[PDB]
Amino acid sequence: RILTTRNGHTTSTTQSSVGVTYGYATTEDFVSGPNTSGLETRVVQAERFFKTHLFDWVTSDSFGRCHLLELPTDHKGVYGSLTDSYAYMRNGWDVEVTAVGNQFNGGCLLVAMVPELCSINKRELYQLTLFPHQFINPRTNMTAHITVPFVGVNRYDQYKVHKPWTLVVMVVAPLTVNTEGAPQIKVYANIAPTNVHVAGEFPSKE
Amino acid sequence: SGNTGSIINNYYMQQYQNSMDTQLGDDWFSKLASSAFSGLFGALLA
Amino acid sequence: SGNTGSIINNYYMQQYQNSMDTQLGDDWFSKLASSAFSGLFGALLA
Amino acid sequence: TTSAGESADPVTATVENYGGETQVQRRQHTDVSFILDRFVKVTPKDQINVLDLMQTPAHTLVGALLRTATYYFADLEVAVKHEGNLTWVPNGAPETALDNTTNPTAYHKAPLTRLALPYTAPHRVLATAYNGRTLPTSFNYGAIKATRVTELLYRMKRAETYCPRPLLAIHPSEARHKQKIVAP
Amino acid sequence: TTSAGESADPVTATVENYGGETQVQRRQHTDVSFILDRFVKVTPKDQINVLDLMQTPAHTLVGALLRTATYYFADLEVAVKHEGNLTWVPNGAPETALDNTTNPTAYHKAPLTRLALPYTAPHRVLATAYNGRTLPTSFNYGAIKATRVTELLYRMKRAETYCPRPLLAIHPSEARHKQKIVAP
Amino acid sequence: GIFPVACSDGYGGLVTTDPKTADPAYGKVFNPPRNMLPGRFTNFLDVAEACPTFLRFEGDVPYVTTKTDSDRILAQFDLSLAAKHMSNTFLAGLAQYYTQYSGTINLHFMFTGPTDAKARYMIAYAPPGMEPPKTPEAAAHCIHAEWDTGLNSKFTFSIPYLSAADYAYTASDTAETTNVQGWVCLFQITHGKADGDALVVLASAGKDFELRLPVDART
Amino acid sequence: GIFPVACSDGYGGLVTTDPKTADPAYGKVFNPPRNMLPGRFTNFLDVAEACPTFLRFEGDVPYVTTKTDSDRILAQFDLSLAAKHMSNTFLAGLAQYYTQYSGTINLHFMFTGPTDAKARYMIAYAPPGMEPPKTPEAAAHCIHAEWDTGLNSKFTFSIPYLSAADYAYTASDTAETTNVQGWVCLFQITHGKADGDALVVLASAGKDFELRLPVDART
């Protein structure tokens, strides 16, 4: 089950793929609306993978232990500079989450992309599957892949004041090592902004 | 369309009764539910 | 014509509901606005 | 877009000049007939009230917009709260007629009386300004009378406006005129 | 039915797997537009009431179901019990407008006032959650005001819902949540 | 003269759920375009079908763990949308706003143990009228399914709608001691080195699951 | 018998803006002819488009004067129909009676100096989210236009509508410290003997300027 994903001049290959989950839609909604008066443009150079460590999954983590990553996050590449050069932006996300141990580990992680996530309560975690998601079950796979479009009450956003998407990873069944499994599993994310459009060029700092 | 059951046309124009939608240029979950796998993944005996 | 939204004909004759206009023998500002120059007065480079 | 500014011919540049795109616009809410076609309250006199659109307060939506027209035409509607019977009389009528019931008289019926009245002036059109401050007495829609009138509202129907005049917003003392906007 | 559970592709087994037969189902009562299209009571404030669907109590049928949508759209109806005249003002209006009668104002008529109002927000759609707890002030349907408002009911019309969110039942202390059911 | 009419007593009061619309007051407003926004749902049951959610077991967890002891019962609960085991599901959240239902409820079981852990499970439906089975042998006579672990980690089973009446109540009456709709019984036939491994279970609406008669009862 | 009808509660009160007409009382009156009177206008925005009106600058004047000093800022104000600079325009007078707008606002600049006075100007639009530019060099990175004086004394520039939402508010909230819609920045690149000469500026509605949702807020 080999899958190779390409975003710009960056590729990621997995031999333990369970496929890709498309959330809420297969294609983006109209990118040119009346709120940008035809002044918007696409920035292909930003549509590439950037990386970040999420957390270390250990045996002491119990059901419900979760990690949240609001998007967009700090970006030190071209995508990041866009947020300092333009007032309005929009983009979707191509998300790949990895948790590598071996096939002798047990336990299970749920990774989901949740819109407008202003903290979630304990009982609500039982229904996290309502959101675009995929599981990471060591006996089967080490990679989760989710792809979602831009969402929001506005056609374009101001990322300095609003984060439409939150990546969440939750432990559903605790990690087991059983003598031959990996002692712990570090969870990493490989993310790429998709269809990035910007509008309203800012002045410089000079 | 929702919980409405009158057989006569509304006395007022649509332009007054409701806001009017505009276009640019159960949808998703209905398609998702309809696409559900509903069989057996293996071989069936008797 | 203004802020009126009934789909049924008025119960009373027009001759009673309103005064009647007579003839002898947004007009001006609409024409003025429509005639506005909307380009460039000179030569355009790229 | 450069042009001869002394000319007065309207010039309307667009965002296309620098690569933008002009959008679609819907202007029903700034249509003259539509915007003036709504009730506006006026402070009444106890008994005799001459129907005169200039009684509308100048800062109100209807009052301000009406005053941006020098000449106008319109039929009228009134909603009146009154005690006793309400009698209306046309433009040019002797004041004494206000007490005679054969002139359109509405018998009291709670909570108020709504009436449609026709334009009745001898002029082809009326004005909000007249250089002859003070307007000719013939500029009116007749008069009404009742034992006591408590509320009087005017509503312009089929309105027509000619020759625009100044329309002023509030002048701020600060860089912007700030107001508390409705919020949850 | 066995399958790859890590996938997330929906799997719907049927009783046919063991010789049963799937029946016919009628789901009109779980249709979004239909279920939200009914009045729900909200506790009002004495005079100024900003129309905001998030005022609906979270445990009510309308409140709970509305909160299972992150984004929604709907026109509105209100039924209000009030003293004096009721004035409504659109989204973005200065609070001061609540005292001016040319804005939609309903004169008192026992026992209450029912009004159909249009969506009026500047956004293409509104939300029940916003990651910017607290929602932007522009998320409202205008505001109403009267000498005193005693009852306020909201009714969503033509409702549309996007992106489902958790919907929680009561958590029982026992093996089952038991309630006294209507019986003769 | 004019049309005579009879203003009828008993008609005209405001009914919170009536099928008519109010009179309008503010016309001609055009909304910002919103065609083809992602994630739309038009019927609550479509998401209940497409998105299974977690059951809750002793200890506030969505799984049951394999055990090594003569007792092979993994879980046994009342087939009721008001059951504690179902209390955190989307299905139960929706069901509380309706008084009746009929149709299939699907249960999903996902094995989470390591590759060298194997097990064989059994799910059975025990109808009302007799105490639920305590052993797999006794439960064999009920409608049931057995399956083992392997490459595919998930198994789905349809709990059938079986009752005297065409609809059943979503709520459980206080004078109702023994469950009216029966029990779902999850057993462990045996296992191979799967001690402590978790089997997570979810529930979703089946093709003919139906909810009717909306009701607002608090909750 | 006669037609039975239900007089419904919640309907029938007078609404100051309702879509129906009153009953008539005095019929058959014919008006004096008034066809083809000059100067008619049927939509307030047609005159807002066709008749630009003056902006107001420090000192109660409709112009800004060229200066000779390192500071090249001629004017900088909040893009708001509630701005002091726009307070005497017809556009602002109309906008106060609506809660929302979208579309283009055109600015007109007319040089008034003598024939032997020359200058080069720059107009820029700085979006919200960052402090407005203080110099022409910094403002160069914004949407902008530069032009010089000559035979044609006037230059017109369209301020674009750019925002997250499809509509913006005409009024400015008191809890709004930094302008929500940005700033218009008028700079002087340089000049040739134009000290004390005036550049008058006007504003008019653009082709897609739109006002919606009438409101009477006093003012």
Numbering used by the authors:
A (entry chain 2): 13 to 218
B (entry chain 4), C (entry chain 4): 15 to 39, 65 to 85
D (entry chain 1), E (entry chain 1): 1 to 132, 157 to 208
F (entry chain 3), G (entry chain 3): 1 to 219
Excerpt from the publication:
Structures of several serotypes determined at near atomic resolution have revealed a capsid composed of 60 copies each of four structural proteins (VP1 to VP4). A prominent feature of this otherwise rather smooth capsid is an exposed flexible loop (∼30 residues) on VP1, termed the GH loop. This loop and the RGD motif embedded within it (residues 145–147 in the O serotype) comprise a major site of neutralization by the host humoral immune response and mediate FMDV binding integrin89101112.
Comparison of the PanAsia virus capsid with a high-resolution X-ray structure determined here of native PanAsia confirmed that the integrin had not significantly altered the virus structure, except for the GH loop of VP1, which contains the RGD. In most O serotype viruses, including PanAsia, a disulphide bond bridges residues 134 of VP1 and 130 of VP2, causing the loop to become disordered. Reduction of the disulfide bond stabilizes the loop against the virus surface abrogating integrin binding.
